[PDB]
Design a protein around this motif. Sequence first.
Motif, PDB file in Angstrom:
ATOM      1  N   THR A 187     -70.990  36.949  10.982  1.00 50.39           N
ATOM      2  CA  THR A 187     -71.905  35.342  11.081  1.00 50.39           C
ATOM      3  C   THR A 187     -70.889  34.895  10.196  1.00 50.39           C
ATOM      4  O   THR A 187     -70.077  33.322  10.257  1.00 50.39           O
ATOM      5  N   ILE A 188     -69.484  35.901   9.446  1.00 50.63           N
ATOM      6  CA  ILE A 188     -68.665  35.197   8.432  1.00 50.63           C
ATOM      7  C   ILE A 188     -67.035  34.599   9.213  1.00 50.63           C
ATOM      8  O   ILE A 188     -66.461  33.639   8.884  1.00 50.63           O
ATOM      9  N   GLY A 189     -67.715  35.225  10.674  1.00 54.93           N
ATOM     10  CA  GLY A 189     -66.299  33.997  11.589  1.00 54.93           C
ATOM     11  C   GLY A 189     -66.656  32.898  11.663  1.00 54.93           C
ATOM     12  O   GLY A 189     -66.428  32.447  12.639  1.00 54.93           O
ATOM     13  N   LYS A 190     -67.988  33.345  12.815  1.00 51.48           N
ATOM     14  CA  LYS A 190     -69.040  32.269  13.037  1.00 51.48           C
ATOM     15  C   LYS A 190     -68.496  30.694  11.776  1.00 51.48           C
ATOM     16  O   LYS A 190     -68.217  29.898  12.250  1.00 51.48           O
ATOM     17  N   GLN A 191     -68.703  30.828  10.571  1.00 49.70           N
ATOM     18  CA  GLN A 191     -68.738  30.309   9.382  1.00 49.70           C
ATOM     19  C   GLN A 191     -67.758  30.170   9.533  1.00 49.70           C
ATOM     20  O   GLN A 191     -67.267  28.642   9.342  1.00 49.70           O
ATOM     21  N   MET A 192     -66.716  30.202   9.617  1.00 51.01           N
ATOM     22  CA  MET A 192     -64.984  29.699   9.003  1.00 51.01           C
ATOM     23  C   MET A 192     -64.454  29.188  10.681  1.00 51.01           C
ATOM     24  O   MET A 192     -64.013  28.154  10.525  1.00 51.01           O
ATOM     25  N   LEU A 239     -63.984  25.003  10.200  1.00 50.38           N
ATOM     26  CA  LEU A 239     -62.486  25.053  11.746  1.00 50.38           C
ATOM     27  C   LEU A 239     -62.784  23.691  12.094  1.00 50.38           C
ATOM     28  O   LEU A 239     -61.929  22.707  12.112  1.00 50.38           O
ATOM     29  N   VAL A 240     -64.177  23.527  12.581  1.00 50.45           N
ATOM     30  CA  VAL A 240     -64.208  22.395  13.467  1.00 50.45           C
ATOM     31  C   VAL A 240     -64.789  21.539  12.641  1.00 50.45           C
ATOM     32  O   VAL A 240     -64.528  20.197  13.201  1.00 50.45           O
ATOM     33  N   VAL A 279     -56.917  20.473  10.336  1.00 49.43           N
ATOM     34  CA  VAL A 279     -56.209  21.686  11.169  1.00 49.43           C
ATOM     35  C   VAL A 279     -54.677  21.206  12.001  1.00 49.43           C
ATOM     36  O   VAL A 279     -53.771  21.823  11.962  1.00 49.43           O
ATOM     37  N   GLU A 280     -54.754  20.040  12.848  1.00 48.62           N
ATOM     38  CA  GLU A 280     -54.901  19.499  13.617  1.00 48.62           C
ATOM     39  C   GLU A 280     -53.817  19.281  13.485  1.00 48.62           C
ATOM     40  O   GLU A 280     -52.315  19.610  13.800  1.00 48.62           O
TER      41      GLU A 280
END
Length: 96
Positions: free
Chosen positions: A39-44, A48-49, A55-56
């Motif tokens: 879930t933390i990876g999904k949140q991160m 990012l999106v 970030v680009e």
Amino acid sequence: MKLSQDSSQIELLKELMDLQKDMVVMLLSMLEGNVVNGTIGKQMVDMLVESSNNVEMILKFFDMFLKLKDLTSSDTFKEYDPDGKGVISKRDFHKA
């Protein structure tokens, strides 16, 4: 970007880089207990999106600078004018 677009202001750029390093270290500390579908990876990745453009631009800045470091001593720029120190009229530099 605004600090790299000019000289004599490298201290603020270095401090901003250190702050970004600490921020990504915090993100890594958040992720260091993740699973493949965490879930933390999904949140991160959602964050990012949401901040895709920023970030680009950051990744483009880093790519530019790393490619410059690679190209300055790649084919002919390190022996272009081997008389003294680096003496480049910057026209040959732009062309290359």
